[PDB]
Design a protein around this ligand. Structure first.
Ligand SMILES: Cc1cc2nc3c(=O)[nH]c(=O)nc-3n(C[C@H](O)[C@H](O)[C@H](O)COP(=O)(O)O)c2cc1C
Ligand SMILES: CC(C)=CCC/C(C)=C/CC/C(C)=C/Cc1c(O)c2ccccc2oc1=O
Ligand SMILES: O=C(O)c1cc(=O)[nH]c(=O)[nH]1
Length: 367
């Protein structure tokens, strides 16, 4: 019966509507429909096995919506209604900006992948601040109930001082967030990924952390850094070193890839931008695995990239992720994928002898 509307969405509704609508229009409609609560509430009730305690919070389940789906904080409540254990909004830039010219998003259905080059289209900090303020106390209760909120920060295209952009984000949205993400891994703003370099990252994160530490206790979020899947071994070593040196609270692993893996079939494979979905999956999992080992398992990781099944989620958890996110799978399978991942993950945890998600975190490293 759950499998179910899964089949209807996956085999008929989503393919048909994707046939009618370009991906950007489709995404806007999805955000709209989700924000209005037009989707029926998720039948799957989260078992205690799926609960995770990390980043100073309880997470009712470990499956979140990745940044980029709700860039401007318009659909947070509808996303919880869809069954996500946590919601991340953004990336948000300090000033509003339009992003790159169209077209800028492409489906690769034969690869179960997407390529995007949005370039941080953002309503800006002020608009998002007011949107989150309008439901701040509702979010306080949701968080207390095991449904935390993350806010992902970006920087403006024309900004001279990257660190000041991130600092402003901490000041404006830090007080409304359970965790903040310093997104230094978008492939679609020139020079951004260079902020992952050791010296630049250290300077940037020192400032971010100083700003965060200046917030009142009740409004003091955890700070995570979101990294690329395309880093050298040296880059990864350096990130791990800075993270430990500064006491960064966690990592989001990974953003989209600028690589184009051998075997892509989609007609649009050579479009510029970040690739997401299935071709990113194991590249992301391996990056999680490496970051977990480099941080001695002491630094919480949110694993993201190509998750569309319980198996995909559990592989990332066993590689070292405390939580996972998805986006691209939602675009192909629709809302039922959320319950699907959770049900399959629970079943696999039981089959592999885990008491719950927490027991599985980093399990591959202890074999
Ligand atoms: C259309 C689109 C827009 C995105 N926008 C953002 C963003 O603004 N900030 C960010 O940190 N990641 C962004 N991402 C990356 C996702 O958060 C995620 O890291 C990546 O897509 C891998 O997950 P997936 O394979 O489940 O989509 C975006 C991805 C897509 C497909
Ligand atoms: C939240 C969700 C996936 C569906 C909500 C309800 C609804 C009526 C969706 C209708 C149409 C549709 C084409 C959604 C898929 C979709 C994309 O194809 C898409 C492609 C690239 C990047 C982001 C995208 O966002 C989407 O939601
Ligand atoms: O806005 C975008 O282009 C974007 C940002 C980001 O962090 N990742 C991505 O794939 N796209």
């Amino acid at each position: 019966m759950a499998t179910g509307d899964e089949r209807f969405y996956a085999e008929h509704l989503m393919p048909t509507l994707q046939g009618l609508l370009d991906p950007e229009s489709a995404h806007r409609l999805a955000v709209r429909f989700t924000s209005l609560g037009l989707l029926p509430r998720a039948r799957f009730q989260d078992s205690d096995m799926l609960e995770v305690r990390v980043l100073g919070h309880k997470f009712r389940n470990p499956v979140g919506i990745a940044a980029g789906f709700d860039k401007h904080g318009e659909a947070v409540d509808g996303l919880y209604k869809m069954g996500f254990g946590f919601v991340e909004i953004g990336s948000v830039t300090p000033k509003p900006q339009e992003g790159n010219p169209r077209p800028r998003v492409f489906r690769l259905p034969e690869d179960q992948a997407v390529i995007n080059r949005y370039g941080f289209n953002s309503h800006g900090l002020s608009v998002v601040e007011h949107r989150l303020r309008a439901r701040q106390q509702k979010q306080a209760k949701l968080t207390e109930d095991g449904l935390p909120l993350g806010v992902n920060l970006g920087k403006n295209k024309t900004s001279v001082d990257a660190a000041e952009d991130y600092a402003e984000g901490v000041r404006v949205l830090g007080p409304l967030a359970d965790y903040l993400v310093v997104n230094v891994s978008s492939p679609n703003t020139a020079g951004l990924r260079s902020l992952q370099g050791k010296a630049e990252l250290r300077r940037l994160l020192t400032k971010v952390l100083q700003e965060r530490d200046g917030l009142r206790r009740v409004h003091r979020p955890a700070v995570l850094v979101k990294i690329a899947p395309d880093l050298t071994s040296q880059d990864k070593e350096d990130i791990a070193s800075v993270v430990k040196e500064l006491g960064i609270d966690g990592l989001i692993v990974t953003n989209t890839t600028v690589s184009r893996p051998a075997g892509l079939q989609g007609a649009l494979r050579s479009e510029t931008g970040g690739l997401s979905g299935k071709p990113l999956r194991d590249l992301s999992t391996q990056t999680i695995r490496e970051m977990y080992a480099l941080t001695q398992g002491r630094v919480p990781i949110i694993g993201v990239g190509g998750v569309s099944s319980g198996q995909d989620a559990l592989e990332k958890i066993r590689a070292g992720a405390s939580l996972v996110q998805l986006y691209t799978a939602l675009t192909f399978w629709g809302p039922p994928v959320v319950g699907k991942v959770k049900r399959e993950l629970e079943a696999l945890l039981k089959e592999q002898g885990f008491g719950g998600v927490t027991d599985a975190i980093g399990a591959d490293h202890r074999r």
